[PDB]
Every structure is written in structure tokens, then in C-alpha cells.
Amino acid sequence: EVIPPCDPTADEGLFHICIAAISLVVMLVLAILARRQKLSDNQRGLTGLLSPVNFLDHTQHKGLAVAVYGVLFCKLVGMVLSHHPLPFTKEVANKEFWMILALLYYPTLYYPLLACGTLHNKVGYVLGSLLSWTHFGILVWQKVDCPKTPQIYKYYALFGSLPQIACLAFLSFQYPLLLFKGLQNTETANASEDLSSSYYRDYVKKILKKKKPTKISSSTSKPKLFDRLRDAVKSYIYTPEDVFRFPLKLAISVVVAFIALYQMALLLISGVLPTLHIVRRGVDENIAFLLAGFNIILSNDRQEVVRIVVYYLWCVEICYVSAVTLSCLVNLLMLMRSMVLHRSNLKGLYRGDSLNVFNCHRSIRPSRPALVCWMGFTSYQAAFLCLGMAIQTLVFFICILFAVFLIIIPILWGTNLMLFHIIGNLWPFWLTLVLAALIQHVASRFLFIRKDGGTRDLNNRGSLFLLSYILFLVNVMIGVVLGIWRVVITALFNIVHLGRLDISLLNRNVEAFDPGYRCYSHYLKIEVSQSHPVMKAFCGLLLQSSGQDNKVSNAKRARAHWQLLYTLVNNPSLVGSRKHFQ
Amino acid sequence: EVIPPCDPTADEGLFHICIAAISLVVMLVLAILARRQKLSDNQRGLTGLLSPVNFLDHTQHKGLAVAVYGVLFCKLVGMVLSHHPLPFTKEVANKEFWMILALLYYPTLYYPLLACGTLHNKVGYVLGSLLSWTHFGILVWQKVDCPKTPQIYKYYALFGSLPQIACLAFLSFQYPLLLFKGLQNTETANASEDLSSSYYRDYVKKILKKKKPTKISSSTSKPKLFDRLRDAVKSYIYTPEDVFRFPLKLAISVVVAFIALYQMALLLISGVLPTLHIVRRGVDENIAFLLAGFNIILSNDRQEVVRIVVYYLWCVEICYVSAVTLSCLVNLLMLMRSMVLHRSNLKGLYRGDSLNVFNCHRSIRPSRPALVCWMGFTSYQAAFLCLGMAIQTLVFFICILFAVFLIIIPILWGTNLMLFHIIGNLWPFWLTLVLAALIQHVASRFLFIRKDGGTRDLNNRGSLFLLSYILFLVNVMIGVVLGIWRVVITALFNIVHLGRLDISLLNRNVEAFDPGYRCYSHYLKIEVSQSHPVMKAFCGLLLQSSGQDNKVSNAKRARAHWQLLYTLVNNPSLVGSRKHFQ
Amino acid sequence: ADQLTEEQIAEFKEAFSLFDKDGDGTITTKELGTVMRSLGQNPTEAELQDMINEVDADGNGTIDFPEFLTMMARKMKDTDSEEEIREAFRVFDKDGNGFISAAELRHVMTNLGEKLTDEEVDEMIREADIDGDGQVNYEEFVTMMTS
Amino acid sequence: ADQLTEEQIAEFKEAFSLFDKDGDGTITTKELGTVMRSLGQNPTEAELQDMINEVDADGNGTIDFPEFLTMMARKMKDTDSEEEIREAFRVFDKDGNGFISAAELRHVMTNLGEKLTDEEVDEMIREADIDGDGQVNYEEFVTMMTS
Ligand SMILES: CC(C)CCC[C@@H](C)[C@H]1CC[C@H]2[C@@H]3CC=C4C[C@@H](O)CC[C@]4(C)[C@H]3CC[C@]12C
Ligand SMILES: CC(C)CCC[C@@H](C)[C@H]1CC[C@H]2[C@@H]3CC=C4C[C@@H](O)CC[C@]4(C)[C@H]3CC[C@]12C
Ligand SMILES: [Ca+2]
Ligand SMILES: [Ca+2]
Ligand SMILES: [Ca+2]
Ligand SMILES: [Ca+2]
Ligand SMILES: [Ca+2]
Ligand SMILES: [Ca+2]
Ligand SMILES: [Ca+2]
Ligand SMILES: [Ca+2]
């Protein structure tokens, strides 16, 4: 009902031209410095441009990369809603084709932001800060004026840009903050990615020292239903004190999922309630009378029908709000749960142990299609969550109206009693499914099963073969109640765990065809074959001792020959695997 | 449109009185003979009545028990359809309560049929044959007159009783056939259930002799797409030459499932096509014109609308026939597949091996709720299949109209083109999901992955971290196509394998809450703890040698001491488990 | 009684477990008489004390697992694997002369416990003296494995 | 360098496998120089030939898995487990006198191969002779495990 003209939008067509002129310069400046520093693998193996931040480091600071992907995802959200958004200076060429290259446009535009972190010098952060000042400057100035927008909702683009604002603010408090750390000569250090931190050393230290905390304590005891409120804490515990740091590609995928949860929860609320209050206002009771009289019965008092139809459109709005707040809470509970399970999956794949040994009994081998699944694991995580919030809300919406219109209202008020004329006409029938299932459990523990010496339980036969024959046609009617439970409990479990990748929804025997669990294993297999935290700590002792260091070395060898013996005495089974492998 | 009066039905109220007078006598005759034979566990441990045929024998002849359960299931099918069927001489007492004790009535009525097989004498088969003559006599005579019945269909009760007729005919060719075998003095033998057949002896023989066929042959080679028509034969092969016989309770459950498949396939066809031909005849084109003119557009030629609406009600009948013949074929394919997998699950549980060791690593212990799942496993198998044919047909019906009304008709005729105005308006869009997924597979195998000596493949880094960043927003749009595939492939797999018990539909980590797989493991656990085919062959050497058999026995001991040595020489690891367990 | 794989021993390990509910690894009389009752028969307690005596060779009244293995190993075997008894001779004879002394016998019991008294060892060889010599033939060990 | 469980050795078995692509169980120079290149650095080939020489004690130019284990076992250990070196003394000393001879030393190499020549065995004990005696103290074995 309001339309703002915008001097920012009239300049946004030139801010498309301005910023893309800035981003093209800084990329080619970094092409000059790479021909002035004799860099490692960080150069492009096809042209020579810089790589962005190294993904196969576990000790690298992950504030920049989580920030930039958190911005690049939000521009995808706004791009779907606005139909037009980039016709601006290029040809359309069958306009739906022009809604494609914008997928390749935003990562090109934000590319010099990540590119500064790979150098750690006075050049990078000065160029890095001013760009993060600029994008934070343009967005905030666009939203101070014109908050009300006629696209979707009266406040939508303001609330739609709340992650994208605050995530650029993290770039503004990091590039000057890390430039200020250059006073301590943190720019004379180099891009050695195996820089022996305390993390790599303490992780090997945790393996060998472990024998002294291996001595266990006692066990505690908690009573009923508070341990049940404590075993749920045991699934909450993502915390525990550990020398363990995530991969970079996995750490991005949790936050980018968390932004995607925020965007679907806003799109569902602010797309439905506008078309509900309008009906709640514009009731047209004179017209809804003829809408009633053409199909159904007035049933009394056409004035009171205003009280009637409103008293149901309360409950449609109450249901659809409760459906989103249920579905948003569950996926919030799952990504927290998906955080602790990435920890235990990844330590168990260090050992080659018997946890994920359904495929870890085979060879670690970085094949071709293992690598494509790694290229773009973060996108799969945030894509399966947006479909999660769609289906879960569409299901729970129909699962609460079935409760509200059938058991909640009649216990509250008592208008319609449709189920209690069904269950009230089967009240002797469901007794016999109980009593026969009662007589099978009761007669088993007290007559057939005979606990004996050693608590070993045998059976009093003969009479049992009869009882499993009298109850034959009864147990078919129990077999229908378990039949609908198998269908239900598979439905709930397929939707709750629908937005997770670490878990396969199919059978044990056919896990490899579920495409979600397929791309997660091939991620986690190539992550351990490249950056294992023991061989990356091992080269630290061979590098930082080499750069900082006869019969005298034979005395070192005389210690070395004894330390070979001191290991083999306390480790017997290695002696065969020494002599067969010497 | 026809109504038969029935002199059988007017006598069926007395045939209810007649047969129940016969069945009560023969049960109490067997109570007298059990006080004249000093029987084993076959007596009731609460009253003293006979047990029916022993279920925990693997060598007992399974023609009787499969026949009687095949009759007892069919009476359940007819009992649901007729609302009234037993008001006849007893009180109604809230009539829906009177539709309950009939579940306990038919196994009481057919009880002396199974009870004859547990004696093997001249008394049993003479009494057994005449009863099987009688029930076969009454049913056939009821169906010679009055085939046409106004209940459901013109031929329904004739086609509805085709298993129940022919399964009593097996009782008529078994009780006189086994009575005729009593000429060879097969009634002087006893009810020793461990009767050492060739089965128990050859099964132990297959274990020890196995070392001489353990020498393997070569391997064959077959080209493409005929091996694909041969690996499907490898799932068909239920055949192979083996000394292996099913449990009795498992062997019943396949046939009773096969009858239940026949009954749902008849109820769906003969309940829907009557209400379809009537509309195909009684079209009322003058009335359907006003049915058309009140909602939609005539669009031409109200005479030709007769050709129009008929040309769609061809396809509704063609779809619903094809949906049943698809769903009947799949469950036919699954129970054949469920037959071979019961073989391999059960041999692998003899070993305690590493196949079903998700629970076989724990203790074999016949607990209380393990026994209830065994009591009535056959009912669960035939209950989950009737729900299988319901849902599978309801789903496939909606999955073919989506094909027939959208791709089949327009390629055939070309009236409506609803999808090819959707896909025709995205023809450049889906190219880029291909080309980016093309460029990830192509550039990986030819630039990054470097096969080296020893076929060990490493990667040319640096350039790859860039490519997994340019393609970030593209891979979200690939992540939606895999998102709907995860939802689809879980749906198909949940319906195809819905009528199986040997397979858990939930995750690996939560199999134990699926109630179908729960009752199958607790079956198969108590089946091996009672009748293992090695300890049941072991007591055969201790029984049939005891009833048919100093320094001379010390010479037998001098052979026995040497045979202890001959085993321990060729089996080294048992020596510790001999001396620690002597 | 020959060499077996892990699986072929794993089943006999399993079926042995269905007798001894103790987990101790041995079968008493009452640990046996319940199973015979479960398959129908009611044997005489004096007969069951005789029925263990065929299986038990150590005479301790209880049945070990290799005592359980040899009972099923005797009577369901093939006729002969002539090389494997010839393969057995390389352990029972250090000499290679084919003649197994009582001193060459006690070398094997030295490897495997030497559980029995030497008089009972002397009573073993008195069976194998149909050769007319008092010395174990190549065939004496063979006929003991056949019957 | 102390006693470990199966899991604690299983990881070092795994990280060793990421070097030797042969599966042979040993690391050459070119089997090493590819991994150092993969983490960025370009070492001198003469330096890499020196870098193996710290690890390899047998002097065959190649690295064994217990040769790989001791490198990580030295420098990330705790200060001392005083009982376990005292637990080690029961194998290195039959006498219980605490004094480890060259004859008591070669008993252990007899158990574990006796891979080295006796002159090189003689060059071992010449390190432990700061006691002023030519005899291994209780503490001589201790200081060799610390540094
Ligand atoms: C509870 C259900 C059966 C009620 C039906 C809901 C409606 C919306 C239909 C339409 C599409 C259907 C969904 C599509 C496919 C799946 C994925 C499967 O892994 C779980 C069931 C689930 C999620 C279906 C449930 C039922 C469904 C959601
Ligand atoms: C293919 C589907 C989604 C189309 C929807 C079909 C209609 C009939 C709805 C109504 C009830 C729904 C079914 C009920 C529950 C289940 C069990 C689940 O383990 C697989 C999906 C399945 C079988 C649903 C599929 C969709 C469904 C069949
Ligand atoms: Ca015992
Ligand atoms: Ca014994
Ligand atoms: Ca000799
Ligand atoms: Ca002789
Ligand atoms: Ca090698
Ligand atoms: Ca070496
Ligand atoms: Ca000494
Ligand atoms: Ca000294």
C-alpha cells in the first residue's frame, strides 16, 4: 500500500558498476604479489590466481570463512524472491537464462574478502578492511531509509537482512583487529601450514598420556525421571574437555545451516499470516451466509455465525504458528545433536575402529567420486535443511488439526464428538486385544518360563503349543495394531531425521544408495586421508627440529638402540611385525 | 438382483449344531487315550488335553499344519464381510461383543483335525479321515447349488472359497493315505521326537565332510546385461542342494501369507469394478451436461462428450487393474525373496557368526518377552501383508495416473501439455546443473587426481580449493535435486519392503523399536535355543546306541585316549581351552 | 577329528553351549538329564551315568568340549584321508622310521600336558600289539582311526 | 615407549599407512618427499636424506613401523612412570642385583633377534659408563629414557 522510490536503488545500478570495478582490481593486485613472493600450492594450477583460505587446515582461524559463506548464502535467499534482480547492464538473452549467471556472480564479487587472509601482511588487511567497511556501509545506508517495502511484507527486507548485516559486522571487527596484531611482528611469519601449534602436540600427547587417566572412577546413581532428564542432557553434551578441532568445511556447514533455518522460519511466517488477517478482517458475513447456504447448513442464528467462523479461524492461525515453532525447535535440536556426532564419527575414523567399520574395513583410497562429494558438502547440508522445514511443517500442520478439531475442542467445549462415537462403539472390542495380550505375558512369566539355578530359564512345554494355537486368530487382530505402528514410527523417524546427513534412512544393507549418507562418508573419508592429526604432528617434529639443530652421534644411536628395545619389551606383539617388516 | 433361498443355510444353523457335537466328542476321546498311553509332554500342563502337532520339530511332516492354518485363515476373511454371521443359538449381548468369540470358535472347531496326527495309530486316522470327509462334504455341497450370491458380486463366494475347498482336499488325500501306510507297521513306532532321521545325521556330516569340497573351482565370466538378467536369478535361487529343513512355524507363515495375498487381490478387484461398469453404462450424458455446465467448460459438441468422458473412464479402469497387478507381483517377488533369506539368517545363527551379530554378540537366553513374540509369529506375517497390498495399491494408483494423464496420453494424442510448458520453460536452466556437475567430475579425474606408482592417487592441491568455492551457490541448486531423491527413494523402499519381517525399516542404530523386526529376531532366537540341529543330532548318538548295546573296555579307552590326541594335534588352539576347561 | 576351520568349530562350540547353562565349559549329569527330558525321553539315571561314560575318557565324570567334539567326529567322518594320517605321522615320529615308541609317545604328551600316569600309557600300547612285535606299525595308528 | 592398548597402537598403524603407498611396511625417501611436498614445504633432497637418518636406527636407509613409533614416543611422553622402568628391570636383569651386564643384555637380543654385531653392542655400554665402573647402574637405564 506504500511504494518508496530509492536514491540508493537508482545508485544500486551504479553500485553494481562501482563495486565490481573495485573487486576486479584487488584480484589482479594479488596476481602481482603472487609473482613477488614465490608461493606454495596457494596459486592456481591453471592460471595463477590466488586460492582462497585453505580448507584442509584444522588449526587455521575460522572466523573469515564462516562469515563469507554466511553472506553468500543470504544473497541466494533474496534472489529467489525478487524475480528480476539482475537485468541491469547486460543482455537478457531469454531472461530465465539471465537468472543463472548470478549464481556465478556473488562468489566472484565477494572473492577478495577471503583472499586477503592467505597472506598476513600490511597489504592484505588494509585492502581487506576497506572492502568490509564498504559492503557494511552500503547495506546499512540502504536500510536506514526505506524500511517499508511492497514486495512481501511491511517489514520483510529489514528482517530478511538481519544475518547479512551482522555477519559483515564480524568482518569489520576482524580485519582491523588482525591488522592491529601486526604490531607484534605477526607478518614476518610464513604460510607454513604445518605450523606446530599446541593443538597437534597435545593431541599426540593425549594418546600416550591416556594410561594414567585410564584408571576409572566409580559410577553414580540417579533415580527415575530425573536421569531421564539427564540422559537427554547426555545427548545435549557437545561440550566435553578435549583437544579436538573441527575441519573447516564441516564447521562452515553448521552455521550456514543455522542461517538457512532462520530464513525458512521467516519465509513461512511472513508469507501466510498476511493472507490470514485479511480474511479475519474481511469476513463478509452477508456473503459468507450465501457461501454457507449454497453448500451447508446455517444450523442457527446468522448473526452468531460471525462468532462461529471466527472461532475456527482463531485455531488455524494458532495451529500454523505452533507448527513452525515445533519444526524450528526440532531442527534446532538435531543440528546440536549433529554436532556431537561429527565429533565421535571423526575420532572413530582416526582409529580405523569398529564403529564406522561398515566401510572402514576397506581401504582408505581417495578415489574420483569421493572427491566430488567433498567438493560441495556444505551446500548439501544447507539444501537438505530447507526441504526439512518445508515437509516437517506441512506434516505437523495436519497432525495438530487432527488433534485440535477432534480431542482438544470437544474436551474443552463439546460440540462435535466424532471419535467418541467411534471409540464409544468399540469399548468391549479393544478389551480383548488387551486381555489376550495380558494372558500371553502373564502366563509366560509365571507358568512357562522356569528360572532355575544360575538364573538360567527353561520352559514347561506342551501346554504352550496349545496356547499359541487357541490365540491364533486373536493375534491377527493384534497384528493390525502393530501394523499401523510400523507405518507410523517409520514416518515420524523419516521426517525428524530428514535434515541430517550423518545418518542413513534406508536399511543397514542398502545404506550406500541414500545420496545424503553417501556424500557424507566420502567427505569424511577424504578428510582423514589428507590431514590426519598424527602425521601432521609427525612432520612437525621433523621440520622444527631440522631447522633448529660420529662416535658422539653413535652415543645418540646407542640411546636409539636401547629405546628400540624399551618399546619392544613393553609391546610384545610388534616384534613379529617388526621382523616381518624390517 | 437375484436372491437364493438355501436349504443348506437353513440346515447350516443345524450344521453349526451338528459339527460342534462331533468336535466335542473326538476331543474327549483323546482325553481318554492320553490316560491310556502314559504320554510325554504332549499333554496339557493345566488340564490334560492333547497338544496339537509339535511346532519345535524340524523333521515332522508339515502337510497337516499348513493345511489347517490355511483353512483357519480363510474363515477370518469371510467373517469380516458378512456382518451377522453367528447370532445363531447364543445370546447377542451387545452384538459387537458377539463378533469376538468367533475368533475363539473356529480353532476350537477344527481342533480334532490337527489332534489326530500326534498319535499314529488305527484310532487316529479313521477318526481323522471321516472329519476331513465331512467338512469337505458340506462345503462342496453348499457351492454346487447357489453359486450366485447377492452379497458382494455375482460369483464372489465361489471365487472366495477356492483356497478353502482345495486345502480340505489335501486333508482328504493325507489321512487315508497315511492310514494306508499303517500296513507296514508304522503304528508300532513311538512319539520319540529325536528320532534319528537321515536329516540330523547328514547335517552333522555336511559340517565335517566340508573340507573336501572346500577346494574351490574357477570363476566364470558373463557379459553385460545378461549377467544383469542372471544376478536377478541369483536373488531368485531358493533352490540349492542342501541338507536343510525349515522350522514348522516358519513354513506355515509363507503359505498363510500366500493365501492372504490371494484374498486381498480378490477383494480389491471384486469391490471396485462393480461400481465402475455401472457408471460406464449409466453415463447420463444429458445429466452429465448439467454436471459439466455447473462447474466447467463444455469446450465443444455435447454429443462428442460421450466420447470424451468414456475415453477417460477407460483409463481409470486400466490404471486400477494395473495397480493391483503391480502390487500383487511385488509381494509375490518379496515372499520368494523372503524365503531364501530365512535360510541364510538361520544358518548364520547356528554359527553365532558375524552376519546377524548386531544382537548375536550377546547371550542366547530365552527370556519372557522373547516367548510372546514366538507365540504368534505366523499371525504377524499374514497381518503385515494385508496392509501391504492396501497401501501399495493406493500408492501405485496415484503414481500411474500421474504418468498416464501427463506423459502417456500427450505423446499418444497431444491434448494437454501441462508438463512440457513447465519443462519447456526451463530448458536452459537444467543445462547448468548438468554442466557444473560435468565440470566437477571431468576436472577431478583429469587434473586433480594423479594416479602414481602403485596405482596410489594423490591430488594437485590449491586449484581445487578455488573450484569448490566458485561452485558454492551452484551446488545448493544441485542439493535440491538430491533432496527430493532422498525423499523419493525412502518412500519406494518403505512400501516395497513393507510386508517383510526380516528387515528393519529404521536406521541401523534404532532397529529394535521397529516392531516387525523385533518380533522376528525374538522368534529366530528362541527357535535356535530349543532345536539346534547339532545337539538334536547329538542325543541321537547317545540314545540309539544305548538301547542297542574292564580291560577290554580299557582297550576301547585306549582307543579313546588316542582319539583325544588325534584331535588335539590337528587342532592346536583347543589345547588351552581343554586344559583351562578340564 | 581332522583339521577344521574356525566356522566348523564355531558351531560345535555353539551346540555345546546349549547344554551347560553354567558357562563353565563342562556337562554334569543333571546338566545332561534336563536336555534328554526336553526332547521327550525319560532315561534311567543309572543309564545316564552310563551314557556319560562312553563320552568321558578322562574319567572325571564330566564332559569337556574336545571330549564332546570327538564323539561327533568319529561316526560321521568319511572313510579315509590317507595323507592326513600320514601328515599326523610327522608329529608322532621324530625318527621317520614309522615306528612309534612309548618314548616318542610321551614327547607328544609333554607338548600337551602329560595328563595320564605312565602305567595307563603302558596300557595304551598293549592294544596296538597285534603286529607280533610290541612296536607300533605304520598301520596300527591307521586302524585305530578307522574303527 | 611404554605399554599401549590395541587402540593406541591402531592409530599410529593408521597414520603410518598414509605414508607408504606400497603397503610394504616401510618408507623410502621418495615415499617421504611427496608428503612433505603435500603440506607445502620443499625440502632439500640432501636434507631429506638427513631427515630419515634421525629416525632410522638400523641404518638401512628405510623407516620401520617401530622406528616410526619411537619418534612420537620420545618427545610427547610424561616425565616419568617410575614403576614401569622398574618393571622393565625384571626383564633386563635376571640377577635382581640391578646391574645389567653385556651378557644379560644379549639375552634380550637373543629373545628379540640379536640383529646387531657384538662390537656395536660393545659401543652401547661405552655410553653408560659415567658411573666410573663399567657397569650399568639402576639409574643408567633411567637417564637414557628421560633424555
Ligand atoms: C504422516 C503422513 C503420511 C501424512 C501425509 C502428509 C502429506 C503431505 C503427504 C504428501 C507427501 C508425503 C511425504 C513424501 C515422502 C515422505 C518421505 C518418507 O521418508 C517419509 C514420509 C514422507 C514425508 C511422506 C509423508 C506423507 C506426505 C507428507
Ligand atoms: C509417494 C507418496 C508420498 C504419495 C502420497 C500417497 C498418499 C496415499 C499418502 C497418504 C498416506 C501416505 C503414506 C503413509 C506412511 C507411509 C509409510 C512410510 O514408511 C513411507 C511413506 C508412506 C507409505 C506414505 C506415503 C504417502 C501416502 C501414501
Ligand atoms: Ca557345567
Ligand atoms: Ca571329562
Ligand atoms: Ca620312531
Ligand atoms: Ca605292533
Ligand atoms: Ca615402501
Ligand atoms: Ca629402518
Ligand atoms: Ca645382573
Ligand atoms: Ca656405569
Short mmCIF file of C-alpha atoms and ligand atoms in Angstrom, two decimals, chain A residues 391-392 394-396 398-399 487-488 490-495 498 505-506, chain B residues 484 486-492 494, ligand 1:
data_model
loop_
_atom_site.label_atom_id
_atom_site.label_comp_id
_atom_site.label_asym_id
_atom_site.label_seq_id
_atom_site.Cartn_x
_atom_site.Cartn_y
_atom_site.Cartn_z
CA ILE A 391 7.92 -31.01 4.84
CA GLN A 392 8.07 -31.02 8.64
CA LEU A 394 3.43 -29.38 6.20
CA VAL A 395 3.14 -32.63 8.15
CA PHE A 396 2.85 -31.24 11.67
CA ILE A 398 -2.05 -31.72 9.53
CA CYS A 399 -1.11 -33.59 12.72
CA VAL A 487 3.91 -47.41 9.33
CA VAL A 488 3.67 -44.52 11.81
CA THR A 490 8.83 -45.01 10.24
CA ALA A 491 7.04 -41.81 9.17
CA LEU A 492 7.95 -39.82 12.27
CA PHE A 493 11.54 -41.00 12.09
CA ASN A 494 11.89 -40.16 8.41
CA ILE A 495 10.83 -36.54 8.95
CA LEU A 498 15.27 -35.77 7.35
CA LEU A 505 17.38 -43.53 6.32
CA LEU A 506 17.37 -46.82 4.40
CA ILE B 484 13.88 -34.79 -3.50
CA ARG B 486 16.32 -38.76 -0.72
CA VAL B 487 12.61 -38.30 -0.05
CA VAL B 488 11.54 -40.44 -3.02
CA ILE B 489 13.94 -43.36 -2.64
CA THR B 490 12.98 -43.75 1.00
CA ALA B 491 9.29 -43.80 0.02
CA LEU B 492 9.65 -46.52 -2.61
CA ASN B 494 9.36 -48.29 2.59
C1 LIG E 1 2.11 -38.58 8.01
C2 LIG E 1 1.85 -38.56 6.51
C3 LIG E 1 1.71 -39.98 5.96
C4 LIG E 1 0.61 -37.73 6.18
C5 LIG E 1 0.62 -37.28 4.72
C6 LIG E 1 1.24 -35.90 4.57
C7 LIG E 1 1.22 -35.44 3.12
C8 LIG E 1 1.77 -34.02 2.98
C9 LIG E 1 1.97 -36.41 2.22
C10 LIG E 1 2.38 -35.77 0.89
C11 LIG E 1 3.83 -36.19 0.62
C12 LIG E 1 4.12 -37.26 1.66
C13 LIG E 1 5.56 -37.41 2.12
C14 LIG E 1 6.51 -37.61 0.95
C15 LIG E 1 7.58 -38.63 1.28
C16 LIG E 1 7.97 -38.86 2.54
C17 LIG E 1 9.39 -39.28 2.82
C18 LIG E 1 9.37 -40.52 3.70
O1 LIG E 1 10.71 -40.86 4.08
C19 LIG E 1 8.55 -40.24 4.94
C20 LIG E 1 7.10 -39.94 4.58
C21 LIG E 1 7.00 -38.71 3.68
C22 LIG E 1 7.37 -37.46 4.47
C23 LIG E 1 5.60 -38.58 3.11
C24 LIG E 1 4.56 -38.47 4.23
C25 LIG E 1 3.16 -38.13 3.73
C26 LIG E 1 3.26 -36.90 2.84
C27 LIG E 1 3.93 -35.78 3.62
#
